[PDB]
Amino acid sequence: PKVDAIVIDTAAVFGKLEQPGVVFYHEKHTTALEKMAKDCTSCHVETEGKLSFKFARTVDPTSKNAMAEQYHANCMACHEKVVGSYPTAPQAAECKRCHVGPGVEGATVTPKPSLDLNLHGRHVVAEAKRLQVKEDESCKACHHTYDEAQKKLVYAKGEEGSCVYCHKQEPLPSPVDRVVPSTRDASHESCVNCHLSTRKAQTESGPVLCVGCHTAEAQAAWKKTAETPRLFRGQPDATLLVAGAATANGTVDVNWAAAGPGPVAFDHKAHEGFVGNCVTCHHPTQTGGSLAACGVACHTTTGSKDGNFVTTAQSAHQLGVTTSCVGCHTTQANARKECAGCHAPMQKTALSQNSCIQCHEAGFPTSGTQTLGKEEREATAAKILAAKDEKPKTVPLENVPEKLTLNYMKGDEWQAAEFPHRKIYQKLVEEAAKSPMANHFHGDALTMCSGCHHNAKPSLNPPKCASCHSKPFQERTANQPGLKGAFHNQCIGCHQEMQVNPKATDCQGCHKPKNS
Ligand code: HEC
Ligand code: HEC
Ligand code: HEC
Ligand code: HEC
Ligand code: HEC
Ligand code: HEC
Numbered sequence: 200p201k202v203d204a205i206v207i208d209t210a211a212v213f214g215k216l217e218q219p220g221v222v223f224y225h226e227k228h229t230t231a232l233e234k235m236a237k238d239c240t241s242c243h244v245e246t247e248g249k250l251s252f253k254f255a256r257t258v259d260p261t262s263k264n265a266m267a268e269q270y271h272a273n274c275m276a277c278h279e280k281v282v283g284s285y286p287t288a289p290q291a292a293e294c295k296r297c298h299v300g301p302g303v304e305g306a307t308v309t310p311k312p313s314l315d316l317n318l319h320g321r322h323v324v325a326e327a328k329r330l331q332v333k334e335d336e337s338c339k340a341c342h343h344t345y346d347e348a349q350k351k352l353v354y355a356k357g358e359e360g361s362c363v364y365c366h367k368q369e370p371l372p373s374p375v376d377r378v379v380p381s382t383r384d385a386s387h388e389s390c391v392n393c394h395l396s397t398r399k400a401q402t403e404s405g406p407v408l409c410v411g412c413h414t415a416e417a418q419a420a421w422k423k424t425a426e427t428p429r430l431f432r433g434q435p436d437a438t439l440l441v442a443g444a445a446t447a448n449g450t451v452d453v454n455w456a457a458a459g460p461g462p463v464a465f466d467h468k469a470h471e472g473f474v475g476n477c478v479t480c481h482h483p484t485q486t487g488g489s490l491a492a493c494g495v496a497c498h499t500t501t502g503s504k505d506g507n508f509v510t511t512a513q514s515a516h517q518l519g520v521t522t523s524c525v526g527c528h529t530t531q532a533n534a535r536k537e538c539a540g541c542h543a544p545m546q547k548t549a550l551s552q553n554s555c556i557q558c559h560e561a562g563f564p565t566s567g568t569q570t571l572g573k574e575e576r577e578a579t580a581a582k583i584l585a586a587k588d589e590k591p592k593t594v595p596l597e598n599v600p601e602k603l604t605l606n607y608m609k610g611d612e613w614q615a616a617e618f619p620h621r622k623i624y625q626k627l628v629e630e631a632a633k634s635p636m637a638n639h640f641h642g643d644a645l646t647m648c649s650g651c652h653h654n655a656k657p658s659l660n661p662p663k664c665a666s667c668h669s670k671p672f673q674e675r676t677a678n679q680p681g682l683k684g685a686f687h688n689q690c691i692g693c694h695q696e697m698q699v700n701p702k703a704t705d706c707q708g709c710h711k712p713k714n715s
């Protein structure tokens with residue numbers, strides 16, 4: 200839980216460790232040192248305004264010997280000189296005070312600091328306001344590429360994108376015999392140094408301590424503008440994603456014979472706002488990443504090396520990831536408390552046969568070849584998406600029983616369960632109705648009903664739970680309980696997912712104790 204926890208293992212690049220791991224606590228220290236009216240330079244070399252976030256050095260020593268001695272030295276040097284103030288400061292033979300063993304860096308578990316589109320926009324405005332320039336001139340402040348034939352780092356206008364396309368978890372080989380620093384290292388050097396030097400210049404700034412970037416609670420407090428500006432890199436507003444062979448033009452030669460279940464009209468513009476960043480989809484790869492169209496060179500009907508042989512279908516369909524359409528949507532439906540009551544118990548391993556047609560369009564040609572340029576795809580799509588721009592439907596309340604008393608099950612111990620059926624259906628619907636994804640993929644008004652009344656044709660008079668769950672045991676499938684289990688698992692299961700009362704232990708909340 201400790202986002203300020205740093206696991207110092209700098210010296211394992213030399214091979215197996217001799218000792219249990221160190222775990223330095225950045226806040227204990229920053230708190231202590233800010234008391235002593237001592238700033239960051241107490242532990243970090245400042246070179247022309249810019250701090251290094253290496254501990255008490257600018258270079259890493261080249262033997263284990265030297266590194267470990269430099270650590271010990273600089274660590275215990277300050278301890279020695281604050282013995283008066285902090286007599287409890289670990290001393291040297293006190294191996295376990297520093298080598299405490301296994302650790303978790305809190306920040307590795309908490310959610311990532313990122314510049315989402317709204318926050319990114321604030322940085323563009325602030326940087327522009329600082330350099331007293333028009334927004335398009337701000338980018339050079341932060342975005343760069345290495346020029347081999349110029350020996351330095353330059354701003355490549357029109358090549359901006361996520362830092363992670365070069366700054367990765369395991370750093371890439373530089374050109375060059377050095378590394379491109381990791382995401383973690385590039386981010387700290389970059390983000391915090393700028394935040395520090397703007398707090399110094401006493402302008403409005405961002406966080407410099409661990410808790411400010413790495414706890415959900417600080418993240419939640421970050422200011423958002425009322426409007427998010429468009430971050431425009433040549434993306435379409437809508438495009439048609441179609442089976443066939445696509446050249447870098449965006450041109451696809453399509454054989455309509457080969458193309459079923461049908462082209463997908465994708466709302467790119469809506470997604471930038473639904474997702475709130477670009478990299479979640481235009482993901483970093485082992486070697487790089489780009490804002491490139493997924494399907495041109497990387498994800499093909501067959502599967503190319505450039506996309507690790509992940510096919511078009513797979514890149515759209517794969518479960519268990521947020522990079523694909525179905526993967527992201529089902530990730531959300533199962534994570535959100537308002538969706539998870541119906542979605543968590545659904546099977547997690549197959550794509551639903553009901554879902555195909557909510558993405559794949561009908562009524563395109565079923566044979567013939569056609570060349571579709573980029574602009575014709577994007578035009579057709581925008582027209583398909585607006586023409587569905589549909590009032591979604593729910594079941595008239597008069598068709599939804601109001602309240603039910605359930606008395607299916609002597610040697611009993613409980614009265615009949617009272618069950619506020621219409622009010623629950625209303626709450627579930629009113630919350631799903633906030634989600635354009637729910638409203639689209641629900642389709643029919645009867646669908647939501649199926650979250651409880653499942654495994655049968657949708658109906659306004661669905662069968663009784665007993666009709667399937669009171670069947671003899673040898674007739675039920677393995678995950679098809681008897682009737683008490685059906686009710687308990689579905690009722691209580693949803694209450695536990697959605698965090699609603701009565702809780703599983705609040706027996707009497709559903710059924711009052713019996714009068715024997
Ligand atoms: C008690 C006298 C010991 C012993 C036997 C060791 N240490 Fe330390 N140690 C500290 C820090 C910040 C590092 C760098 C960590 C890293 O980069 O991996 C180390 C590292 C070591 C090593 C080399 C790594 C290894 O386990 O092989 C060794 C051999 C080692 N230590 C032994 C910090 C501290 C302290 C904080 C003030 C204290 C006290 C100690 N170490 C004490 C000891
Ligand atoms: C000048 C108007 C620009 C343009 C055209 C872009 N940027 Fe930035 N940017 C910065 C950082 C740290 C990131 C990554 C943040 C993260 O991954 O959490 C980005 C990201 C982008 C993207 C991709 C956005 C995405 O969500 O994938 C793009 C297309 C982009 N940038 C273009 C840092 C900065 C700045 C420092 C405060 C400045 C100024 C800019 N970027 C400016 C621009
Ligand atoms: C954040 C503001 C962005 C930006 C700057 C871009 N995207 Fe996307 N995008 C997605 C998909 C599936 C496509 C492919 C459609 C196809 O194969 O043609 C694209 C396409 C692009 C482009 C290229 C357009 C071209 O003609 O080559 C560009 C420059 C682009 N995008 C930028 C998918 C997504 C997302 C999935 C939910 C979201 C989020 C983003 N993109 C966000 C952004
Ligand atoms: C356009 C916005 C997309 C979409 C929707 C996907 N990709 Fe890629 N992909 C590439 C590589 C090299 C891999 C293997 C792992 C890696 O190197 O990161 C993948 C993997 C995927 C997945 C599977 C899970 C995952 O996120 O890793 C999915 C669902 C997926 N992709 C979808 C390569 C590339 C690119 C390199 C030229 C391009 C561009 C894209 N992919 C674009 C997209
Ligand atoms: C809290 C830990 C408990 C305990 C000990 C029991 N329940 Fe429930 N229960 C619920 C429903 C819809 C039924 C079918 C009702 C009926 O037709 O009588 C039941 C049934 C039972 C039984 C068997 C019936 C009997 O009268 O003995 C038993 C032993 C039982 N329950 C124990 C629904 C709920 C809840 C709805 C959200 C929750 C909470 C509970 N039950 C909690 C408990
Ligand atoms: C590839 C086109 C890159 C992108 C996108 C980003 N960076 Fe970068 N970065 C890249 C290289 C090749 C290097 C130098 C590697 C070396 O051999 O030294 C860097 C360096 C940095 C640094 C360190 C500067 C130093 O004194 O060493 C920082 C702080 C940094 N990069 C940050 C950064 C940010 C914030 C980016 C997105 C906004 C970003 N980089 C993108 C290559 C590429």
Ligand code: HEC
Pocket residue numbers: 312313314321322325326340341386389390391393394397403404405406412420421422
């Ligand atoms: C200048 C070169 C910056 C770099 C690079 C990064 N940040 Fe920044 N940050 C900067 C400024 C001038 C401001 C204030 C914006 C304004 O209103 O004028 C900020 C603000 C933030 C905040 C907001 C804090 C809040 O609103 O409560 C955050 C969370 C933030 N900055 C984070 C951040 C991250 C994560 C960065 C790298 C990925 C980053 N900043 C880079 C200046 C600069």
Ligand code: HEC
Pocket residue numbers: 463464465466469470473474479480515521522523524525527528531557558633634635636637639640
């Ligand atoms: C997250 C990383 C997503 C990916 C990748 C894709 N979708 Fe998505 N979609 C997502 C959200 C969060 C939303 C609505 C906001 C909400 O909270 O409900 C949507 C919505 C849709 C919709 C319905 C609205 C519309 O665009 O018409 C559709 C049809 C949809 N998404 C389709 C779609 C396709 C075809 C995708 C991949 C090529 C895709 N989505 C990816 C979240 C994310």
Ligand code: HEC
Pocket residue numbers: 525528529531532535537538539540541542550551553554627628630631632633634636637640641646647648649650651
């Ligand atoms: C019970 C009242 C439900 C609530 C709450 C939500 N969903 Fe739902 N969803 C429900 C059913 C019965 C189905 C049909 C599933 C089937 O197997 O046919 C769905 C379907 C979806 C889908 C499509 C799933 C897929 O196969 O790709 C999505 C993307 C979806 N639902 C999203 C979703 C969201 C985001 C919700 C909270 C805002 C939500 N659903 C609630 C039943 C119920």
Ligand code: HEC
Pocket residue numbers: 594598599600603605620623624627645647648649650651652658659660661662663664665
């Ligand atoms: C779970 C939260 C439910 C959703 C959403 C809907 N229904 Fe339901 N319903 C549920 C239970 C546990 C029961 C009792 C079933 C039993 O075996 O006794 C019902 C009952 C009905 C009934 C029967 C009413 C009667 O008097 O016998 C009807 C006609 C019915 N439900 C319709 C219905 C519709 C139309 C729904 C969506 C609009 C719907 N239910 C949602 C659980 C849940």
Ligand code: HEC
Pocket residue numbers: 540541605616617618619622623626627650651686689690691693694697699700701708709
């Ligand atoms: C999600 C798919 C649900 C399932 C299955 C069941 N319930 Fe539940 N329940 C759900 C919600 C979202 C709420 C709050 C509705 C509101 O706005 O108030 C409830 C509430 C109840 C209550 C308390 C009603 C109230 O005090 O307002 C009871 C007693 C209750 N639910 C019982 C119950 C039974 C007996 C179920 C199986 C027959 C059952 N619930 C299923 C969501 C879900």
Ligand code: HEC
Pocket residue numbers: 207221223227228231232241242254270273274275277278281285287288289296297
């Ligand atoms: C001054 C510039 C210091 C440097 C450099 C290092 N430490 Fe420190 N340390 C310092 C103070 C003022 C304190 C007292 C804080 C307190 O809560 O009493 C400490 C304490 C520690 C501790 C003990 C924590 C506790 O008992 O709660 C440890 C384990 C520790 N320091 C380790 C440590 C390491 C590994 C350092 C170099 C990476 C290091 N310290 C440097 C002041 C200073």
Ligand code: HEC
Pocket residue numbers: 544545546651652653654655662663664665666667668676678679680684685686688689690
């Ligand atoms: O995805 C699958 C496959 C097996 C199957 C079930 C399973 C359940 C479960 C297990 C979890 C799940 O949904 O997969 C539960 C908890 C369950 C409960 C249940 C309730 C509370 C019902 C009435 C509101 C209900 C009705 C019911 C009907 C009428 C069924 C047949 C027409 C039926 C079948 C069924 C199968 C084949 N069930 Fe159910 N159920 N059930 N049910 O579900």
Ligand code: HEC
Pocket residue numbers: 205207209223225228229232238239241242243252253254255383384387391407408
């Ligand atoms: C008591 C010494 C000390 C003080 C003072 C100090 N730090 Fe550090 N900081 C460290 C140590 C140790 C590391 C781990 C780096 C290493 O092993 O070289 C670190 C790392 C960091 C990191 C990177 C963390 C990581 O895991 O990548 C950031 C960011 C940072 N410090 C910022 C600051 C800021 C801002 C201040 C001013 C409040 C500050 N530090 C003051 C000791 C200190």
Ligand SMILES: *[C@H]1O[C@H](CO)[C@@H](O)[C@H](O[C@@H]2O[C@H](CO)[C@@H](O)[C@@H](O)[C@H]2NC(C)=O)[C@H]1NC(C)=O
Pocket residue numbers: 446447448450572
């Ligand atoms: C771009 O994509 C393909 C590269 O593989 C080109 O062969 C493709 O064909 C062109 O289509 C144009 C439509 O405007 C024609 O003007 C014509 O130049 C043709 N080129 C040929 C047959 O060699 C290119 N399309 C576009 C829109 O640029």
Ligand SMILES: [Zn+2]
Pocket residue numbers: 435573574577
């Ligand atoms: Zn266009």
Ligand SMILES: [Zn+2]
Pocket residue numbers: 608611612613614615
């Ligand atoms: Zn009973």
Ligand SMILES: [Zn+2]
Pocket residue numbers: 587589638639
């Ligand atoms: Zn729709």
